[PDB]
Write a protein that binds this DNA or RNA. Structure first.
Lengths: 285, 285, 285
RNA sequence: UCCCUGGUGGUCUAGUGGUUAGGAUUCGGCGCUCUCACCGCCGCGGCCCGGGUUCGAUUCCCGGUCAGGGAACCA
């Protein structure tokens, strides 16, 4: 439906709705990143119960938008598979000091594939990148870290400081707004470096992209669910004070547990559809 | 260049000219769906000759507009192929009762590519959809059509009835206005369904969209050509009724049969170019 | 900007500094080609010593601009190396009448590398091109120069006359203004001569582009050095006419030899810095 | 090489620190007329993008944008 707020003026309702409609465009797509939108809720200007209801509705709409856009990186996954295979071939051609030890990493790179679950996908990419970078480091005769518990740093190899700085800025930017992805003019491939190194660096860039998108989204969803649950519990603590028909009705709506954004959809739709019945409880303005 | 209408007042003429451009952005893009525009032609008010001439002009302009817009779906089938590869990617590791059947379907799914011909595109979509629905149904251990000559019906799996109604209505709207497609408010993803089931639902939706656009265009072109061909025969009889220079000239223009889209364009251009020479024939007001 | 002119008006100094600022944008990047600037530098109207000093300043500025805007053919150099590797790849496979001769020339093609120095680049490209052209001549059974103290000329083999004309015009243009390198021409046909011949032809084009750029730049530098030396000598005579402290200071500044553009920058800074103490010797207005 | 303007529905466009952003406008439907030209009727319908200023701004500052004006070699 359309979000229903208790005490907000039209000026604030339109702003809260415009922040949601345009959530993709804004950099730093995080509700907390914008304290002004939370201020539009009526905190310190409205009754506490109305403020809690407003924040619950806001977080529900925000979580709904988040799940709706929900970037599916089908083509990035396609590219990661290709680049993983390319790293494997360039490695198998290359001659190593200990072909056995490089064989473990070439095998880990061959057995890599995407599972049915997506979170597994983020973990898969990370574990593959570790081996790929280890291989590239061995190729240049650099000494990889062998301290136990200091597995490995995923990093580009034989790239000038400027390029690494630009690429890190790009990946951080994707971290802030996952929904919008920008192509890179700067090219990781360099004529000086070995072809194995160039393949490794391209695979590393794509894997960092996948990992950042997936992890950032999962964290946003976790935070949204936690905020929603806090708001539900506190609002119920408040509504339990008055035993009116409509107050009991609002609590009865809120009884549902809000885990599993499927529950979020059901809760939001139940809130909106029966709004006229329980709205008299909250004190407007 | 502009269409020429014998009897009408400049007002109605401006109305028809506005209609032709508005066609691109309108629900129900079909001339016969709008009785008012056709009646505005001058039916039963003017002489039958003039009504026939005006209707022929309107149908020629309408066909010109449809053929000119004529949506191109190259992006959409390119997206369909990626949707297939994503379905396959989620399908591979899932444990199946008969890996032989699952692997055959995953292979049919991967090798899917679109031909340059459009009709081949419709057949491709149908085959890929049958294969993907079979894979998803097997994933959930539901029974399938074992009969000979029978094939599984294309349907969404593990979706609420209300969501199915919503998407059915949306695809109906796409059928009404093939040029403009409205993004659906709903998202096909569900937390209960696995990644494979969600991928299959999205693939089903995009394939349904493709075939709907294709069939709608086919029917529209068929009706346009039939209506034009009827108007020409009727008008030729009416003109044969009267022997004059302008009447004979218009009949001579109407001799060559328009059974094509280019034949219609030639007819429209020739019938416009000589409007002044033969106009006097048709009685006005 | 830093350039100091004795007797010029504000507008003419602005014109000279603007001409140097916009140097690369103008076609025919050569001062001698642009007469209006050189005449405006000083003039017949101004005194001889003043004219000589003004020409010294203009030439020093022009040399500084040339040396700052020298070309950095990093990408073209990498491309030449890639095409050399390609010619070597297709040389070993091709069946030859006497493979020993081919193997000598292939060995020569295989060592080719670019040192840090830009001056070495033309010498490297020439050796590589001679070897490749001999290889292509052997492949097609052409007669190759065998005379004592004679070398094969670098030319395209089995190319159309029109394509040769187009490329020769492009290379003449590059000779005109080198800072602009736009090598966009790859018109070879696979059904044409053969893989070896085509690879050799592309290599020839890139080598010609590099050699032309380098030679044109070096010629400009040589002319600048000649002009600067002549200005210094004539001015030193004119100043030797008078034995003032100021004239002695101006002479002592002009002792520095302007070969080795580093010396040119030394002279430019020395003139600009201490202008106050010796400007009195120069008559102005 | 310089500065100077502007973006407000479906074009065109007034406003112009808290306003449910308003105009003709087409559109659609009321067709009440030979056709509606009367629209006599509504209704849908819109904040250049992002950040930043206070209690709160499309409406103020800073960047980016796209369209423009006139200023640089030629001008």
């Amino acid at each position: 439906m359309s979000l229903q707020f208790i005490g907000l003026q039209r000026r604030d309702v339109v702003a809260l709705v415009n922040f949601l409609r345009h959530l993709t465009q804004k950099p730093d797509v995080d509700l907390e990143a914008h304290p002004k939108i939370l201020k539009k809720c009526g905190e310190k200007r409205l009754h506490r119960r109305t403020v809690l209801f407003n924040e619950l509705m806001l977080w529900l709409g925000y979580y709904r938008e988040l799940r709706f856009h929900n970037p599916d990186l089908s083509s990035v996954l396609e590219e990661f598979e290709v680049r993983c295979v390319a790293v494997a071939r360039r490695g198998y051609t290359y001659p190593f000091g200990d072909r056995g030890k490089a064989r473990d990493h070439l095998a880990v790179l061959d057995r890599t594939e995407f599972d049915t679950d997506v979170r597994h996908d983020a973990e898969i990419v990370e574990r593959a990148l570790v081996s790929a970078v280890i291989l590239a480091k061995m190729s240049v005769r650099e000494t990889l870290v062998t301290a136990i518990g200091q597995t490995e740093p995923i990093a580009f190899v034989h790239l000038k400081d400027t390029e690494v700085q630009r690429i890190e800025e790009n990946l951080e930017g994707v971290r802030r707004n996952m929904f919008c992805v920008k192509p890179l003019d700067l090219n990781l491939d360099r004529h000086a470096n070995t072809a194995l190194v160039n393949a490794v660096n391209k695979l590393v860039y794509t894997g960092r992209l996948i990992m950042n998108v997936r992890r950032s989204w999962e964290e946003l969803e976790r935070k949204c669910l936690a905020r929603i649950q806090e708001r539900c519990k506190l609002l119920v603590k408040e509504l339990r004070m008055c035993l009116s028909f409509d107050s009991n009705y609002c609590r009865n709506i809120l009884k549902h547990a809000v885990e599993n954004g499927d529950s979020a959809d059901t809760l939001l739709e139940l809130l909106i559809e029966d709004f006229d019945i329980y709205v008299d409880s909250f004190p407007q303005s």
